[PDB]
Amino acid sequence: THWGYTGHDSPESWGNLSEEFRLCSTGKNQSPVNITETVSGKLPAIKVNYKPSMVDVENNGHTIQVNYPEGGNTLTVNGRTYTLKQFHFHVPSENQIKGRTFPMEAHFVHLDENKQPLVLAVLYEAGKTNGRLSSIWNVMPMTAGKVKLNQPFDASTLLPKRLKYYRFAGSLTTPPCTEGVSWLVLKTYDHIDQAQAEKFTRAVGSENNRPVQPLNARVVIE
Ligand SMILES: CC(=O)Nc1nnc(S(N)(=O)=O)s1
Ligand SMILES: [Zn+2]
């Protein structure tokens, strides 16, 4: 069923669109979130085993996304291996740091062998052109549609070397807003210039951030 970020269709009504999106309105563990208060703790280190792959770049109407047809690219956290399925973008950011919205956020979405979802997040500050995204921005379908990119894409360039993160449990920020999703929001910020963010918005047709949800019972670990 149709949903979006504006119109009579907007995030605050997602739960009533159908019975099967109801968690969007009724869940207590929803993403995204404003990360204000945190607990300093000893989080397991991330190990990135990303490498180049043959990807396609899809406009599904709601974001620009890079689909990984094969496993290949993994993340090991806490002796668990998670397989990168796809990554995609929000302009502006869904998650916030101390009330601060960022001009873009990237969501790297995974499953482990138990099919447990993990989202590793990168927040972009305004700054110089992102040279490592230009390859994806250049083939960006500006309407709904899908192109396989000729030259291999390496996602290791999209993650910093400093891999400190905020950790919390949450949900998909798009319908059906399924809960039980591990969130790891990296502290080290990448950058995008203004054209890049505007083009994206132009392509997808709107700013595509779900608004922040209450933490309720949850604690964010830094
Ligand atoms: C199959 C799949 O991954 N669907 C998603 N829906 N929302 C997502 S997000 N913005 O939380 O990372 S991913
Ligand atoms: Zn997302």
Side-chain angles (χ1 to χ4, degrees), residues 13 31 59 82 101 119 128 146-147:
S13 289
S31 290
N59 183 314
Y82 300 83
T101 293
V119 173
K128 276 193 288 78
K146 173 195 158 190
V147 294

Side-chain angles (χ1 to χ4, degrees), residues 16-112 114-160 163-178:
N16 306 117
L17 296 193
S18 55
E19 58 256 291
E20 67 220 63
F21 295 167
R22 192 85 199 121
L23 207 61
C24 299
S25 64
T26 67
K28 286 279 172 43
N29 296 109
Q30 294 281 298
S31 290
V33 318
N34 188 7
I35 313 185
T36 52
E37 265 172 283
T38 62
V39 168
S40 180
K42 300 139 53 174
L43 285 161
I46 308 162
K47 279 92 199 194
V48 187
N49 323 112
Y50 287 3
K51 79 171 173 192
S53 286
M54 306 306 302
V55 307
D56 43 275
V57 183
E58 185 211 2
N59 183 314
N60 71 349
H62 325 288
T63 175
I64 304 315
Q65 188 169 114
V66 169
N67 304 311
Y68 275 64
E70 303 193 356
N73 289 248
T74 72
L75 205 163
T76 296
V77 56
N78 202 220
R80 222 153 274 78
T81 297
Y82 300 83
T83 291
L84 165 71
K85 311 298 315 195
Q86 57 89 350
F87 70 76
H88 68 261
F89 290 101
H90 292 271
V91 176
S93 63
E94 306 201 287
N95 298 285
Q96 294 167 0
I97 311 310
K98 317 154 291 164
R100 167 163 188 197
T101 293
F102 294 73
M104 192 175 70
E105 194 170 355
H107 289 162
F108 299 74
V109 165
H110 316 67
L111 297 160
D112 68 15
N114 319 336
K115 261 222 152 215
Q116 276 298 127
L118 182 145
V119 173
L120 181 72
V122 176
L123 291 153
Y124 297 77
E125 304 191 301
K128 276 193 288 78
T129 183
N130 197 282
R132 290 152 291 116
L133 282 171
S134 56
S135 217
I136 310 289
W137 261 235
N138 266 338
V139 303
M140 179 160 314
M142 306 284 303
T143 82
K146 173 195 158 190
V147 294
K148 306 169 158 45
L149 179 43
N150 262 247
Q151 303 178 307
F153 189 62
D154 189 9
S156 63
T157 58
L158 296 197
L159 305 179
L163 280 160
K164 290 304 222 313
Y165 64 98
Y166 305 94
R167 174 80 164 67
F168 63 91
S171 91
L172 304 184
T173 77
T174 57
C177 310
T178 305

